[PDB]
């Protein structure tokens, strides 16, 4: 196996539009890896076995005159949650996003799974999870809406078994 250094780079992403009509528990997910149009996509489609973690950064653009709270977490082996266990998503590595105190989250996770190497065209171990803890509240002097962004990058990518071209 070999480690690649050109595939560890950031990739901006749009998660969702944080509005005021979305109540608590509005859950938005983004399984990783997503459709990478850069070197990582060629790595996925031109190598079979790979292992890597993920460093996710999450920012919501707004102002201090708005209220609300966003829980960002990285769920291993994602599964759909009924509203009952949405109260327990703090168990996984997580941070909070609330316009009053912070502006940007930062979560780093290792590679983990049943197999020492994974084929992400089939299995997606880690998953980005963002939810509204408290609804976005605005006034005549506050922003009516907030757009949040994804900031992700594969870390410590290790690969074996190079694949032939398709041309």
């Amino acid at each position: 196996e070999t480690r690649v250094t050109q595939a560890e780079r950031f990739f901006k992403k749009h998660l969702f539009n944080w509005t005021t009509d979305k109540p608590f528990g509005h859950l938005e997910k983004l399984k990783l890896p997503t459709d990478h149009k850069g070197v990582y996509g060629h790595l996925v489609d031109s190598f079979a076995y790979m292992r890597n973690g993920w460093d996710v950064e999450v920012s919501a653009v707004g102002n201090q005159f708005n209220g609300g709270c966003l829980l960002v977490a990285m769920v291993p082996e994602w599964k759909k949650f009924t509203p009952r266990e949405k109260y327990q998503l703090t168990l996984f590595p997580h941070q909070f996003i609330s316009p009053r105190t912070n502006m940007t989250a930062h979560i780093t996770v290792p590679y983990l799974g049943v197999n020492r190497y994974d084929q992400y065209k089939k299995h997606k171990p880690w998953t980005l999870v963002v939810m509204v803890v408290s609804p976005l509240t605005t006034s005549s002097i506050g922003a009516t809406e907030i757009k949040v962004y994804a900031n992700i990058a594969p870390t410590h990518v290790h690969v074996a078994g190079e694949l032939p071209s398709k041309e």
């Binding site: 399984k31 291993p76 082996e77 994602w78 599964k79 949650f81 009952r84 266990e85 327990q88 998503l89 168990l91 996984f92 983990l112 799974g113 049943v114 197999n115 020492r116 089939k122 299995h123 997606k124 171990p125 998953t127």
Partner: protein, 167 residues
């Protein structure tokens, strides 16, 4: 404080009944009842490793083929065959899965909601099997997951009858 009774190695080292039993049974720890002690604390982790002691009450001889063995290998006595004693048989099966650790939730599939078929401890066959108990030894759990308590509809709390010696 003395926090020994919440130990993961201590709380899982008890026998738990497996409800669905057949003449040919593939020992899967996911078949335990989801609301049991061991069943729920197993669901409360994503990955687990454990040995397994089985107490089986059967008629005729019992054959245990390890993981990956073909289904037709259950009809031969070369695989460890237990000649039935009076009450039941008590064996110690090892960890025979190819993966380093098993899993309780899988995000996706494994072929080029349903865990992969490689998540098992082997198979057991006899003329019939009436009851089967599985005991997890030197267990270890990874990546904690939500664990839910019973819900309350309209009362102040959960109102349960505790045992009392009242005459």
């Amino acid at each position: 404080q003395r926090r020994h009774h919440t130990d993961v190695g201590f709380i899982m080292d008890r026998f738990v009944k497996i409800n669905n039993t057949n003449p040919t049974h593939v020992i899967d720890l996911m078949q335990t009842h989801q609301h049991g002690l061991v069943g729920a604390l197993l669901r409360a982790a994503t990955y687990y490793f454990s040995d397994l002691e089985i107490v089986v009450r059967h008629e005729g001889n019992l054959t245990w083929v390890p993981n990956g063995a073909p289904e037709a290998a259950l009809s031969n006595a070369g695989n460890p065959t237990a000649y039935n004693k009076a009450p039941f048989t008590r064996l110690a099966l090892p960890y025979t899965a190819p993966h380093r650790v098993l899993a309780t939730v899988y995000n996706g599939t494994s072929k080029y909601t349903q865990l992969p078929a490689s998540f098992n401890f082997g198979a057991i066959r006899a003329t019939d099997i009436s009851e089967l108990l599985v005991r997890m030894k030197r267990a270890e759990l990874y990546c904690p997951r939500p664990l839910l308590a019973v819900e309350v509809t309209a009362q102040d709390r959960h109102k349960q009858k505790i045992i009392a010696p009242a005459k």
